[PDB]
Amino acid sequence: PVPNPTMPVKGAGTTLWVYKGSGDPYANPLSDVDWSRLAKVKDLTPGELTAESYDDSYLDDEDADWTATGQGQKSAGDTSFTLAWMPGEQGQQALLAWFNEGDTRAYKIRFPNGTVDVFRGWVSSIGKAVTAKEVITRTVKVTNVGRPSMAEDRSTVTAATGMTVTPASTSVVKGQSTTLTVAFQPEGVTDKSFRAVSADKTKATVSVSGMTITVNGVAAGKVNIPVVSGNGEFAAVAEITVTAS
Amino acid sequence: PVPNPTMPVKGAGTTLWVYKGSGDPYANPLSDVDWSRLAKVKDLTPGELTAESYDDSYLDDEDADWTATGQGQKSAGDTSFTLAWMPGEQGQQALLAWFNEGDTRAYKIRFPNGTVDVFRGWVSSIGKAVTAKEVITRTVKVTNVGRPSMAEDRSTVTAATGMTVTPASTSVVKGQSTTLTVAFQPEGVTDKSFRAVSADKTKATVSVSGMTITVNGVAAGKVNIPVVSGNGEFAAVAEITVTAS
Amino acid sequence: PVPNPTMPVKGAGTTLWVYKGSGDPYANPLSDVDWSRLAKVKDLTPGELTAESYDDSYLDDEDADWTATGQGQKSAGDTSFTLAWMPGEQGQQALLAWFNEGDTRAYKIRFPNGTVDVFRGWVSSIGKAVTAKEVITRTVKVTNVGRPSMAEDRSTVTAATGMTVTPASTSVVKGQSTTLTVAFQPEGVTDKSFRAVSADKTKATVSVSGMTITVNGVAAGKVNIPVVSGNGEFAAVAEITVTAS
Amino acid sequence: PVPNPTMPVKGAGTTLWVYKGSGDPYANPLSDVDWSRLAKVKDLTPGELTAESYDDSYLDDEDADWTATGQGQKSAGDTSFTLAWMPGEQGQQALLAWFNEGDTRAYKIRFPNGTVDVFRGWVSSIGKAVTAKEVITRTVKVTNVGRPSMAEDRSTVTAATGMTVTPASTSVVKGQSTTLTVAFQPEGVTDKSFRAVSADKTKATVSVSGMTITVNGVAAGKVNIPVVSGNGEFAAVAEITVTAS
């Protein structure tokens, strides 16, 4: 359905583009103008950002019982991919020219949830595999240089206005489960962490799964189930009257 | 049944949290206040404690038939985990900011038996795996610094049996304050952290000072004031009916 | 982000300048007016300040078992650096003019912590390295004359107004550590030396690491931990009540 | 935590100090009164004691097949250390002033086993190292003059077991003086240096005369008067409640 960057997503629909223009690729990566697509992608391994360790040990330190280090220089890794070998396609000739020239160019990866990842690098490997029963493939590797523009850099924090639990009042029979739904206003809230707790464990118990609250009526009576947001700025109280079987 | 640290337990329900507070993380790891959860964990490999060898041999030793060594410097290793890639959540944005900054921060692992493990470290790797028929995953590695705080350090501690708020029901006149007292059973509870929150801020407001809760009746009516312990295992709900002047 | 001349700094961002003017170079080394930069520095080794030994021995001294000497004439050393070879730049042309004329000129080394070192000298060596797979480099050596202007010469001492330890009161459980932070008022205090001691070592022990104080509650009870500044003009007393497990 | 000089100790925790007082550095090296620490020591190399050769042969000896010699003049060598470059610290400014002046001053090395070595010398070299990925270091070399004071010279000494201040609690009226007595256990302690300091100067002031402490109640209230030994291994806290006239 509608892409949502706050929910888990499957890889199908991921695309790869290379920048051709003379502007800033980092300014607005969401526009496809001056970008060329590399179609027929079979495998994609994005670059891995790593860092080295720096020693922070001194002789006059009280004790060397445990090691102490800090973050050093950072790297953007290497990005690898595979494509259907089509020498007549313009994008593949452009990639070959990129490899031959040796300059640093910008490439972006587009995900089915509406976000993009932008990297800059130079081509370091070109390969090919030939098999009688399979389609000939082209393997490409790009060494990245500098700090990339990850998708999290384009994410906007949104504050909440209120929290609602539905339904507010419900009766549960012993040995049965009831479903409670908690919602945040508006629909664009970034922080949706919350804790559902039971005042009386014997009278009722609560289990949290996603946005659904399950209540078990172990003992009959009236039990209050408070719900408090993770930030703790809002609160919701749900009253359940457990009915004996 | 009841979580028992003296009998074997299975891994389901292991959670991971990162510290956002300014106090001592090691002081009260059992309280969930000032901690943020990294939801949707797929794989988790804790850091391994390892110590180096130190040679303890001399030329004048009479018995050189066998080797003699001793324990040297101790290390905490690296902790790795995998999450579902959700760039729109605050947790992963905070993780990316933590990696970019390069500082050393504290995190904790909560086990299904009621114990916690606390580490201090810095992020050293960020990765991504993309495939057609599986959820895109984010792989994170953290290098630990210093002395960790394992569960065995907190083995002699007294758990709580219940939490009570007194008085339960009270009426407050507009422009006046009411005092509420929260107590833990038994008197030897070590973790007494709690959070008092208001369902309706306009109807009433709450201020926390020590073990006393102050309620101001800004607007007349019936307002529910839930109280949840810092660990979040108990809950107390106090109902106050504000009376107009 | 933190131009602090009182804390350790890595070397990246260090720059080299040569004076081109008629005014006094030592008077205002913080201004870049009338200074020309030498870009693309690859390696830098500053001058080493040394001294000579003068024999203070006499025939009539009773104690001649041990040698006695004194300080003699002092030298400024030699400064050697390497740049990227670009004969078209004006700075490299001025360097060759400086070598050919044989004049004694002033040069500055600017460090990433906001401090500068100014020297005066004459060029003694000009070299080059040619490699097929490496960029051609220019090697320069300057012999310094006279007393230089070190960064410590421009440092201004600032007195303190008060010392605070935070938090003042804390309770520690046996087998756990507590962090204490000591601060000086104002933020520009030059002398931040302090000794923090324990009145009762069995009841508690203290370890000093940087500005953080670690307290171990070996024995339960009330223990006073006095901290005295290195100058001894201020004093801070921290009381910790150790709680048995 | 094992200060035993009869068995081997690792080198972690060695500290460097410089004398500032006008007394005798060799009289009580254990006390840290009038000494300043040089923190952030990356590497240390103490001076080496060496002796020259003196020819004792003659023409009339019946045996001349083998050479015969004797011990000549003695030298204390050169002590070389490396610190982190922090020009804002008062210690490095004082070190630079020491190098510039040419005076011969005393310095101390303290080992983790509880022993001290005292040398007298003058600075002979000042160096610097600049690297992009490494902290800037300051290299110092000192040439020693005269006879040093090794730890083996102080192999006969009485360690202190405890320090007591009597009386612990006292009330002083404004405009009156109170006498406090400090004692060391046992009666044969060799190092009896101590520092008595006031947390609040306005509330009370302290003067040190011999083993008697005089307290003046300038302002009424409760004031803590910590007392710390010169070595700093013991601490005593005396609380005085000043009563208004």
Q: What is the CATH number of the domain that holds D63?
A: 4.10.410.40
SS (H, E, C) A141-167: EEEECCCCECHHHHCCCCCCCEEEEEC
Number of domains composing chain B: 2
Of the three residues D131, D154, D177, the one that is the final residue of a domain is D154
End-to-end C-alpha distance for chain A, whole angstroms: 42
CB atoms within 10 A of CB D209: 8
Same domain, B43 and B71: yes
Question: For the CA atoms of D167, D170, D175, D181, what is the dihedral angle to 10 degrees?
Answer: 10
| CATH classification of the domain holding C213 | 2.60.40.1080
Asked whether the beta carbons of C63 and C26 are under 8 A apart, the reply is no
Contacts 24+ apart (CB under 8 A), C3-6: C3/C112, C3/C113, C3/C114, C4/C113, C4/D88, C5/C113, C5/C114, C5/C115, C5/C151, C5/C155, C5/D86, C5/D87, C5/D88, C6/C190, C6/C192, C6/D86, C6/D88, C6/D89
Chain C residues with beta carbon closer than 8 angstroms to that of B154: 176
d(CA D119, CA D144): 6
- The subunits that touch chain D, with at least 3 C-beta pairs less than 8 Å apart, are A, C
d(CA D138, CA D84): 6
**Method in brief:** cryo-EM
Question: For the CA atoms of B218, B223, B224, B229, what is the dihedral angle to 10 degrees?
Answer: 0
d(CA A95, CA A17): 11
Chain B residues with beta carbon closer than 8 angstroms to that of A115: 87
Chain B residues with beta carbon closer than 8 angstroms to that of C176: 26-27, 149, 153-154
Minimal-distance CA residue of chain D relative to C163:
D199
Asked whether the beta carbons of A188 and A158 are under 8 A apart, the reply is yes
- The subunits that touch chain C, with at least 3 C-beta pairs less than 8 Å apart, are A, B, D
Chain D residues with beta carbon closer than 8 angstroms to that of A55: none
CA distance C175 to chain B (A): 7
Closest CB to D41 among A58, A64, A72: A58
DSSP-derived letter for residue C154 is: G
Same domain, C110 and C22: yes
Element (H, E) at D93: helix D90-101
- The subunits that touch chain B, with at least 3 C-beta pairs less than 8 Å apart, are A, C
- How many angstroms separate the Cα of D241 from the Cα of each of D112, D172, D197, D219? 39, 7, 16, 10
Of the three residues C116, C134, C153, the one that is the final residue of a domain is C153
Closest CB to D42 among A58, A62, A63: A58
State the residue range of the domain holding C222. 162-243
Same domain, C28 and C144: yes
User: Which of B24, B28, B31, B103 is the best substitution to test chain C (most C C-beta atoms within 10 A)?
Assistant: B24
Structure tokens at B190: 């070590």
In a domain, B1, yes or no: no
CA distance D18 to chain A (A): 15
DSSP-derived letter for residue D204 is: -
- What are residue B138's phi and psi, to 5 degrees? -115, 125
CA distance C207 to chain A (A): 7
Binary contact (C67, D74; C-beta < 8 A): yes
Which of A234, A239, A226, A151 minimizes the C-alpha distance to A193? Answer: A234
Of the three residues D107, D133, D154, the one that is the final residue of a domain is D154
Which of B137, B144, B83, B85 minimizes the C-alpha distance to B117? Answer: B144
Place of tokens 């493939």: A137
Chain D residues with beta carbon closer than 8 angstroms to that of A62: 12-13
d(CA C15, CA C40): 9
Same domain, D186 and D146: no
Closest CB to B74 among A6, A66, A198: A66
Asked whether the beta carbons of A41 and A109 are under 8 A apart, the reply is no
Who's near D164: CB < 8 A, 6+ residues apart? Answer: D182, D183, D184, D185, D236
Same domain, A149 and A103: yes
d(CA B5, CA B96): 34
Minimal-distance CA residue of chain B relative to A69:
B145
Same domain, D167 and D149: no
d(CA B126, CA A74): 11
**Peptide bond preceding D167: is omega within 30 degrees of 0, i.e. cis?**
yes
CA distance A68 to chain C (A): 12
d(CA C29, CA A29): 44
Minimal-distance CA residue of chain C relative to B155:
C245
Structure tokens at C51: 């001294």
Helices marked H in chain B: 90-101
For chain B, the C-alpha Rg in angstroms (whole number) is 24
Minimal-distance CA residue of chain D relative to C233:
D197
CA distance D16 to chain A (A): 8
Structure's resolution in angstroms: 2.7
In a domain, B239, yes or no: yes
Same domain, D67 and D130: yes
Same domain, D178 and D110: no
Q: Identify residues of B whose CB sits under 8 angstroms from chain C CBs.
A: 24, 26-27, 149, 153-154, 156-157, 190
Who's near A18: CB < 8 A, 6+ residues apart? Answer: A35, A36, A38, A91, A94, A95, A98, A105, A106, A107, A108
User: Which of A55, A60, A71, A73 is the best substitution to test chain D (most D C-beta atoms within 10 A)?
Assistant: A60
d(CA A183, CA B173): 33
Minimal-distance CA residue of chain A relative to B35:
A230
d(CA A104, CA D79): 51
CA distance C196 to chain A (A): 13
Same domain, D50 and D168: no
Same domain, D176 and D142: no
In a domain, B62, yes or no: yes
CA C137 to chain centre: 29
Same domain, B109 and B221: no
In a domain, C2, yes or no: no
CA distance C166 to chain B (A): 11
Q: Identify residues of C whose CB sits under 8 angstroms from chain A CBs.
A: 207-209
Same domain, B187 and B69: no
In a domain, A7, yes or no: no
User: Which of A55, A62, A66, A71 is the best substitution to test chain C (most C C-beta atoms within 10 A)?
Assistant: A62
Chain B residues with beta carbon closer than 8 angstroms to that of C216: none
Minimal-distance CA residue of chain A relative to C9:
A56
Structure tokens at D72: 């000549």
Structure tokens at C93: 């042309």
**Beta-bridge partners for A223:** A240
How many beta-carbon contacts under 8 Å exist across A and D? 29
